[PDB]
Write a protein that binds this ligand. Sequence first.
Ligand code: QNP
Ligand code: QNP
Ligand code: QNP
Ligand code: QNP
Ligand code: QNJ
Ligand code: QNJ
Ligand code: QNJ
Ligand code: QNJ
Lengths: 446, 446, 446, 446
Amino acid sequence: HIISPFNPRYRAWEMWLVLLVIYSAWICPFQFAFITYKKDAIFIIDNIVNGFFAIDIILTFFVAYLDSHSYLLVDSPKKIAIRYLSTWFAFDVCSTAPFQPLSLLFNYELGFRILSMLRLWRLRRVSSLFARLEKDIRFNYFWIRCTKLISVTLFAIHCAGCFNYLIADRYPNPRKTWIGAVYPNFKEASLWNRYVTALYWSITTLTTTGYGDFHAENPREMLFDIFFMMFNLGLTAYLIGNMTNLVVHWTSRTRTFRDSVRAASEFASRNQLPHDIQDQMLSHICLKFKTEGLKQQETLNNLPKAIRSSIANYLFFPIVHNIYLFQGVSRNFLFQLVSDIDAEYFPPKEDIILQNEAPTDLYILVSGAVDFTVYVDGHDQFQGKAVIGETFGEVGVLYYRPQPFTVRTTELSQILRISRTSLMSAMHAHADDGRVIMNNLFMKLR
Amino acid sequence: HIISPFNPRYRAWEMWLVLLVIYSAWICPFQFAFITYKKDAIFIIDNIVNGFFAIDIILTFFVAYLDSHSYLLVDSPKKIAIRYLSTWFAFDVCSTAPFQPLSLLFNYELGFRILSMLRLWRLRRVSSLFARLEKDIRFNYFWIRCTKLISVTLFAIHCAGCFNYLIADRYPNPRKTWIGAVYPNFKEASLWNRYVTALYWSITTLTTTGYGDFHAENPREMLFDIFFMMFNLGLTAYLIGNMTNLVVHWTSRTRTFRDSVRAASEFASRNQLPHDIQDQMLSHICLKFKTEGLKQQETLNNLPKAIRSSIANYLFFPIVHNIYLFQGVSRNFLFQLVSDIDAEYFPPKEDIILQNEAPTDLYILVSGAVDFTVYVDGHDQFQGKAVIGETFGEVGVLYYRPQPFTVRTTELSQILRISRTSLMSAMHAHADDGRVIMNNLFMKLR
Amino acid sequence: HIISPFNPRYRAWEMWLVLLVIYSAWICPFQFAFITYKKDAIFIIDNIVNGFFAIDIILTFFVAYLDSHSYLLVDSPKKIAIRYLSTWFAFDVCSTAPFQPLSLLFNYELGFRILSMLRLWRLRRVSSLFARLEKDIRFNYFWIRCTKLISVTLFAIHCAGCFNYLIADRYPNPRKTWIGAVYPNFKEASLWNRYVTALYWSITTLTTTGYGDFHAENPREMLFDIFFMMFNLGLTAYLIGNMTNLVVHWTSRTRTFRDSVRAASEFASRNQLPHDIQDQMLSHICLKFKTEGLKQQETLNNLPKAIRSSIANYLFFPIVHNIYLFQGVSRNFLFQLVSDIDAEYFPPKEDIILQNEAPTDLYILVSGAVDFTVYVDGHDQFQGKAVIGETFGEVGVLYYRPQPFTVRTTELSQILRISRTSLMSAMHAHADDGRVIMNNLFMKLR
Amino acid sequence: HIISPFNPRYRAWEMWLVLLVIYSAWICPFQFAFITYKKDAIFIIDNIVNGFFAIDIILTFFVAYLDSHSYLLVDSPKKIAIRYLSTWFAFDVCSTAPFQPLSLLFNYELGFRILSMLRLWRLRRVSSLFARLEKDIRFNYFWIRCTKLISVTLFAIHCAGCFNYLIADRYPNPRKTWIGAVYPNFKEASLWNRYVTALYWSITTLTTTGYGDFHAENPREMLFDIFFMMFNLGLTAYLIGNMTNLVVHWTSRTRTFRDSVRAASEFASRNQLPHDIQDQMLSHICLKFKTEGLKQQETLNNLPKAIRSSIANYLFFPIVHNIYLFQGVSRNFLFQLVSDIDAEYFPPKEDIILQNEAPTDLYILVSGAVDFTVYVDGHDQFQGKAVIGETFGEVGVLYYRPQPFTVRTTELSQILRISRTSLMSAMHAHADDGRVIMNNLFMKLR
Ligand SMILES: CCCCCCCCCCCCCC(=O)O[C@@H](COC(=O)CCCCCCCC)COP(=O)(O)O
Ligand SMILES: CCCCCCCCCCCCCC(=O)O[C@@H](COC(=O)CCCCCCCC)COP(=O)(O)O
Ligand SMILES: CCCCCCCCCCCCCC(=O)O[C@@H](COC(=O)CCCCCCCC)COP(=O)(O)O
Ligand SMILES: CCCCCCCCCCCCCC(=O)O[C@@H](COC(=O)CCCCCCCC)COP(=O)(O)O
Ligand SMILES: CC(C)CCC[C@@H](C)[C@H]1CC[C@H]2[C@@H]3CC[C@@H]4C[C@@H](O)CC[C@]4(C)[C@H]3CC[C@]12C
Ligand SMILES: CC(C)CCC[C@@H](C)[C@H]1CC[C@H]2[C@@H]3CC[C@@H]4C[C@@H](O)CC[C@]4(C)[C@H]3CC[C@]12C
Ligand SMILES: CC(C)CCC[C@@H](C)[C@H]1CC[C@H]2[C@@H]3CC[C@@H]4C[C@@H](O)CC[C@]4(C)[C@H]3CC[C@]12C
Ligand SMILES: CC(C)CCC[C@@H](C)[C@H]1CC[C@H]2[C@@H]3CC[C@@H]4C[C@@H](O)CC[C@]4(C)[C@H]3CC[C@]12C
């Protein structure tokens, strides 16, 4: 018996009202200044529009809302009328109520047009849409906000141009007005010439060009220009502020990358490192930026540490499920195993593990070739290998001994890292470490 | 015997002085240029205003202040005169002292008007108010500062317009001035036409429009325009800077939210997660933003860790006071218990606790339904439940064993979390853990 | 059989195309408005340019690209045509296709010039270059982006000026146009005068000056100015946003330094420290800023903790290799030793180690003199020394006893710091600590 | 034999050169356009200025500099000539060399004035001063940078005005120039009228007003305005960027404070806390902001942890030196004791320690009254006290028992905090804890 605020009916009703509001807001100054009122072909359409909003006044009592403290619903139509009658009812029933149609049919005009300028309270619904669409996900945020600013700027042009043409009509002596002193016969021309002339006056003093045509002579008009140029100063400052937000935010990523590269280059050229350490640092920052892992670190560390477990369970479980070491290790162990795996990504020709380094982490390959050569003991050649899926670092499992070989990449790779302390934290989950240790003993003895 | 600076008398005295300062600052250029001086109907009011400030000069010796290093008072009127006589006394006694009324009554004028332009030192009190109202809590900060800028801009318009009308009066050959070459008979017109014309000239070169009327011909006036247009360049840059602060600060929250959603969507569409993990991540960020917990985390972690204990004592003590487990647990234990409770809030249909997960935390419901179904062992149906107030996670109290069921939400909930390490930290507070363990044994055996 | 996208041939082919695109984009409005078409001396060059792009349409099928998910290559020409035929093929084959040369040779003009305005789709390659050069390392980032903005601004001036000269030619009554009412005989003048006049009109309404010459009289031209001044408002806001990024980013370092100095001075002058502690704090921040160690800390702590080991191995191994203590300590121990050394840098006259201070760290000198004097027990003189390479702090190795002397610098120095906990972490690497302890015993006994 | 770069002689020599550079840069356009050259009264002064710079060319070989990698000196005049002859020698010896005085005395002019426009290379010294004064401590940073921008803007006005007056002189037909068509007789007027007219033209198109006088008619002049208005667009954007930095940086502190208060008020009014917890949170943030402890925390935690020990040794040693507990505790213990003391500051009426709270920290008063009342057991009245210097919290030294009383402030205080873990860390420093424990036993037994 109560209409939910997420039906397909009510949302299409709102968007039909939004098109109707845009119609009313475009007509109202153009009706206020140029055209007369006694003819009725637009009077019909205005009365129909007032009928639609009078229907909406009734129908907003049947609609549920979303409360702030308790969520997802408010029903039982008490407190709905308390919400609607306190916040938005008074100005809506002032705006919806016809006054010109009663003045026309009762006895009878300028004081009745000002009562028709209250139709602009209907323009809150466009603000409610541009509040919804920023916060909705499935839209470009830097498109909606510039659309909002273009809407406000175009409406300011329109309303100011029509009001100045009004104050040019109502004044005796057509000469010494802004349009009279240039065109001496202007009331006999069409609507398109007068409307384009008023619009052209208004935009040359909004966008602060100000050629020198169409300046003011009438002192009341000379008074209107003071308030309009104050308003244009304020709005132009606001517009430059929004475009500064769009430019600062659109290019933050590339600027932060170039900061990191400048800092690495100053640190390198200060201490005079030869070539190799420079190329390692700069290529490693280039491949941190091509796979943008900084936002990955932040947004993974903002997750509630169970959804990241389901992420790693999707990504790395069939890779860890088939290794040299792990054979029969009881997948209910693997669910608690997988969730601490921290992926990584590595440049080519970066010496990963050097000879006689004290061990720190397991390096499961997921892709990419690896080339191992003797370091210090062997001047050149020798042997060293590992292929997709084939782990290494299995010396420092429990042997606690340094790595035999050198580890230099050939083509780029993706290397998982279950480190030493993570392994020793996995040690207390016993009765399945026996299978791992049997795989170690039968692994190395063969 | 010494007036405190927080009386209701002295604050109303200051605000009466602020209205008097605004009066003096509006009159002084308008008196300096347009009107004469020999008539006395405003001379009376100016002498009365000088009387009020001469009273304030005496009365500021009886008032205490707030020192910088030691707080809350300085009394004993030594060092009050040392403060007042060193900082603000000289220019105040130069500004308050009448010079035109002595020139009028002594013997007698342009050199005496410049001595009346020193009345603008009285305008420090408006700066003191706009320093107080930013730092006071009970006002909108983005309203006060724009009011300050509108005040400075309007006063610049006013003073520049009146000074240019002065330099147009004092020059012989009324033609070849800015107002003379357009209106040849301008000294015979009223005050309102000349004042609106001067104001209209001034605003078309402050807001950089510059139509082309009212340009300068007199070379001293052509010299005045150089300094005024330098000043307008500086002030327009300052105004755009302040509106950039208001726009960058007004929309930081929505922009940060949309950053987080873009980063989550790039991380999802890079690694090709199917649907479910995307919808979990995006709905969890949407319900971190509807209940803005990031500012909550920051401002709770900036608190001195006793007021947050009183906060949690108000919020969660009658909820934890009535549980399945806790029955007679000696509320002086509960005061030390409650202060480490970390609240949280959760989306619907997010699988909270999965089957055979190694346990981490207690999950006391505060609201919201919970639905538990068999995971892996059971393909569908089965049973699992918990209602408002009914805790779960009571397996991993001391049993250290994985959870039996799956835990999926149905409608959204608020779930407290006293985690495993927090429980084991609460273990050393003994002689009341016996009641908890008896409640465990009689709880599970039934 | 497939051309790689990193050959020297294909890159020079692209840059030749970029010069050809700049040629076409400069000619096309200037051809559209000023000159005729029936003569053929430029028609030849345009057909040759269309030939070059028709060659490029074929040749872009033989070129490999870089995929997003898997890196470094895509070969095997399937999916290359799927990439190229879906993204960029349609507008390229619309732009490359000649239509004016077919209109000239088939039967025959304004509707055929608009088909020649589609040559501006060729201007995507300039956007691809200005996307590459920001992300490439070996270029100044704040030079490329301002070059991009100057390019867009100059092209807007050019195209708007030529389009307004077109709409001034095509209109009957040469008077009441923008160039007709000032120059009554303008079609008989040269190209340079008309082109400079159109360019001069366009820039006085792009850069919002607007003298007052050359305003519009024709109502269709009065309509064109509305769209052009809207566009200029948008572009001027965008340009101010980019220069705000350049100014905020160019002076962040000096502003952060001056923040730190202001905060230290307020903390000093609040609590009334005499002189010495002020000069120590301020000189220490000055020598943190002359050797900018903050970016060093950040970018070293962002490194993957093996490249920083190779850095410290290059920088400090021949310094630690020759000390009082270390003599025969088996350089495979030294590789694991060096990587935890944290360098530092110190001001002169800063009291480094005071008398009877509980010990915290080893202080190996690398440069700079050190002067030690008796503290408290000795009023003045006494003795204390250490020279380049000569360590101190060797009391608190295992003796766990306070330092004997005071340590005040004379000229500035660079002092390594292997702290107490780092030494005790190095203790478990035994069978070579015996040599260190023998060097201690024979060191102190002599 | 080598002049140090920090003598009082050489710095005064540099500042005399800076005044001479400002003289040359102001004269050079004004000499280039307005005045003739054959008279000699300024020719003398120019030759003298060239003599001063020819002396400086020699004298810059005797001066030491500061190297980048090794600091504080470079002597031994090899590599000084390598620095000076590579970087700055060529353009200095091109600028210093006279060419007009040789043209005047050799045989003989426009091509020789362009050789005199190379005197503007001498203007690097003003850039070196405005690089030094930002980085020097004893100057306001937001004053120097705005002075730099005003200097560049005024010089742009000056040079552009004089160059346009040159291109107005050199053209035949004095009518159809910018100054000719308004003043038909302008070459017969003085210097002040022509100079003010050129300056007034230049500033109305720098500050984008553009009245409508003084527009261009000569096509070469119409070409000059294009480059000058491009330059003014660029410089106006740069100026707005710098004022945006000054406004964003000048009001960051108050804006951050108001952020914290808005976040606390939203967190309070969301969860509906009654009054008391709101007033505690808001008054505690107000007294974190009146004594700005956030910058204190940052800049103390950036200190090298020995200077902060000397700070706490100056601030708190004679306060801790005289307590209830500590009597004879051997001040060489006190030097290691004091350095971990963390000061704090507290609002009035904030309940500091509640009844039956599990203890956390010692609370030595340094000022401010304290009022203790019974909590829960006692409804009202009771007793509780502590005065300046009199510690409390001495229950939980080793008794590990909750506090007896409640602790509510009356007037604001400053309370040191040596916490529980800091005390237990001080426990291993024995052979003087016996005196503390004797003071405990004789303290409580009395
Ligand atoms: C041709 C006819 C077209 C008709 C269709 C157009 C009608 C659309 C109408 C939408 C209106 C809602 C837009 C809104 O809500 O107003 C923004 C605020 O506007 C300002 O800047 C006002 C600064 C004033 C300048 C100071 C005055 C100086 C004294 C919110 O911006 P926010 O900060 O994002 O909330
Ligand atoms: C019609 C009559 C109305 C009379 C009533 C109005 C009187 C009110 C009067 C209030 C005055 C106090 C306002 C203040 O204090 O001046 C701000 C600073 O102003 C600037 O920008 C000055 C930039 C100059 C431009 C460089 C010059 C270029 C060479 C502080 O701003 P802050 O940074 O927030 O402190
Ligand atoms: C004399 C002849 C010279 C011919 C050579 C010049 C041709 C070069 C041509 C390069 C073009 C690529 C440059 C680009 O891509 O367009 C930037 C975006 O431009 C804007 O600002 C457009 C704002 C519109 C204002 C709103 C309109 C208001 C309704 C990207 O900027 P981004 O943000 O960095 O990506
Ligand atoms: C009346 C006679 C007075 C004579 C005395 C004055 C002589 C002083 C002369 C000082 C000069 C050094 C100042 C400097 O170095 O130039 C700043 C940079 O200037 C710009 O903005 C240039 C933007 C160009 C706009 C793009 C052009 C668009 C195509 C550094 O600013 P920075 O970023 O802080 O380094
Ligand atoms: C002189 C002339 C330029 C005046 C134009 C000013 C407009 C910018 C004014 C006229 C009516 C105003 C609208 C009417 C009230 C609206 C409801 C409010 O919840 C949001 C702002 C809201 C949408 C206003 C925005 C600003 C408007 C559109
Ligand atoms: C050419 C014309 C535009 C000059 C107007 C400049 C004004 C903006 C000047 C004139 C007098 C100045 C005021 C007088 C001194 C005031 C005391 C000081 O503690 C705060 C600034 C303070 C309030 C000044 C602000 C700027 C004012 C109001
Ligand atoms: C009224 C007149 C000023 C219009 C000029 C507008 C120009 C600024 C428009 C005209 C053609 C447009 C270009 C054509 C399409 C181009 C491909 C796109 O991938 C990047 C933008 C891209 C390069 C456009 C940038 C903006 C241009 C250059
Ligand atoms: C059209 C007219 C407005 C041209 C004026 C442009 C000036 C802004 C140019 C003219 C000469 C230029 C100066 C000459 C070279 C100087 C050395 C360099 O290390 C710092 C910039 C440096 C100081 C330049 C700054 C910009 C100046 C002062």
